[PDB]
Amino acid sequence: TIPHLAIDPFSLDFFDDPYPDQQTLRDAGPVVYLDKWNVYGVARYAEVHAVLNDPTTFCSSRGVGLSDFKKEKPWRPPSLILEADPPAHTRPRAVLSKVLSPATMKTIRDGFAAAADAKVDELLQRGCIDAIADLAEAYPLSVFPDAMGLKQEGREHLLPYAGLVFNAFGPPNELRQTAIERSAPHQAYVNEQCQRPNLAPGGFGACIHAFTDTGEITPDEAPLLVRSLLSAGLDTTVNGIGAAVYCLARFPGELQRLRSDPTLARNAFEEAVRFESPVQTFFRTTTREVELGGAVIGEGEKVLMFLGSANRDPRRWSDPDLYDITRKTSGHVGFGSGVHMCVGQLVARLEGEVMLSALARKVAAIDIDGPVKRRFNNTLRGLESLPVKLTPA
Numbered sequence: 001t002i003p004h005l006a007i008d009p010f011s012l013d014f015f016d017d018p019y020p021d022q023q024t025l026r027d028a029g030p031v032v033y034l035d036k037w038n039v040y041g042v043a044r045y046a047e048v049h050a051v052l053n054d055p056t057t058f059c060s061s062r063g064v065g066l067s068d069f070k071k072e073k074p075w076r077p078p079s080l081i082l083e084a085d086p087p088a089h090t091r092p093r094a095v096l097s098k099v100l101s102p103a104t105m106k107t108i109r110d111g112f113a114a115a116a117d118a119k120v121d122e123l124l125q126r127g128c129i130d131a132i133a134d135l136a137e138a139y140p141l142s143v144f145p146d147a148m149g150l151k152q153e154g155r156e157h158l159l160p161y162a163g164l165v166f167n168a169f170g171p172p173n174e175l176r177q178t179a180i181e182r183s184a185p186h187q188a189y190v191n192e193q194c195q196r197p198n199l200a201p202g203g204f205g206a207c208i209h210a211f212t213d214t215g216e217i218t219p220d221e222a223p224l225l226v227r228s229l230l231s232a233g234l235d236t237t238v239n240g241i242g243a244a245v246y247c248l249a250r251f252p253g254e255l256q257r258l259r260s261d262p263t264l265a266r267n268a269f270e271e272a273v274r275f276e277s278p279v280q281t282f283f284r285t286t287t288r289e290v291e292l293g294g295a296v297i298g299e300g301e302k303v304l305m306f307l308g309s310a311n312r313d314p315r316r317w318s319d320p321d322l323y324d325i326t327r328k329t330s331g332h333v334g335f336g337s338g339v340h341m342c343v344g345q346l347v348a349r350l351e352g353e354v355m356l357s358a359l360a361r362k363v364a365a366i367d368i369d370g371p372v373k374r375r376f377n378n379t380l381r382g383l384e385s386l387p388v389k390l391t392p393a
């Protein structure tokens, strides 16, 4: 009843061009079995959305990577939010929601926008730049560590640590094994920065620790919640902004529409998140036997959700393979859906908006002018290098 496929969604060939295999996964059936890793897969929008929105049946506390925490030791102590189910999930989630709230966004928006404008002005002086290292990486590095309250020393550990976290959700392939082999110095740095004395006043980290007297979290929960922001808060935005710039570079007609109305910046970023889906995949684990799209899945089974495939499913989207900055993007699953839906989405959207606004106002053309190099990661989709020429407006 359930089709069995040999596709390895964590192979370099798949990462290099996932779209044919993602159509094969969608068209084989609503539920497939991936023989390579002994997991179920759902690649259509309908089933991905259904799984995300039944956290009781499709839980997160047994891990959202391939590894089942009931069978293996987690590579690091479980996240108190990402790798927790209700009710344990609920109060840590509420704390992060209030730490990354609209009021916080109002306090940081002016500085984030000034840094975006400054970066684009700087890049225009150089003309030919690498849109990854010099923009998608450089801009988040210029605002987010400071917004966390991190000291300057050791920030070079942040992107390596994030690459490790996202590789570690994958199966035990070479990408994951190599990441873990090199992890010790990055874990040491990150864990140390999570302690209250090491987080500067008024930043996200200090605000988490300040919430430890309301009865929502205790002081011993705050370091791991800081760890969540140091795991998820930087490399995601790097690949979100990189996706948006890559989209504008490939689709000059959409850059031209964005220039003509810079208030489309926020939706142009949201559409880039749908179109590229920088966070490609997450797993759930079934807590009971369950019927999903005509399939009977037993208890204790891993289910792989293809978020990027769901965001390209023609059953849900018109012209899914087109980048359209005025698309009605509401409902895409690039930030997830339901109780775990990205708690940092207001930070991600703020960064993406102000960067695309700066480009819209200052840049007339974005032309790829060198070899494009892809970066391979078990969970993240994005580029290693994107050489572009920026023409000033």
Ligand code: HEM
Residues within 6 Å of the ligand: 060, 064, 081, 082, 083, 093, 096, 100, 228, 229, 232, 233, 234, 236, 237, 239, 240, 241, 273, 278, 279, 282, 333, 334, 335, 336, 337, 339, 340, 341, 342, 343, 344, 345, 347, 348
């Ligand atoms: C374009 C940028 C981003 C994308 C595409 C993205 C994607 C996602 C997705 C798909 C989830 C759902 C995980 C699941 O269902 O298991 C999630 C959750 C989460 N994200 Fe984001 N994220 C981004 C930026 C950020 C930022 C900037 C932060 C923090 C500053 C952040 C922190 C988190 C946390 C802590 C969770 C776990 C929430 C929970 O389990 O309740 N993310 N993200």
Ligand SMILES: O=C(O)c1ccc(OC(F)(F)F)cc1
Residues within 6 Å of the ligand: 079, 080, 081, 082, 083, 165, 227, 228, 229, 231, 232, 236, 279
């Ligand atoms: O809590 C954490 O450590 C954590 C780590 C990664 C993560 O990934 C993404 F969902 F994509 F943002 C979310 C949360």
Ligand SMILES: [Cl-]
Residues within 6 Å of the ligand: 076, 187, 190, 191
């Ligand atoms: Cl760690």
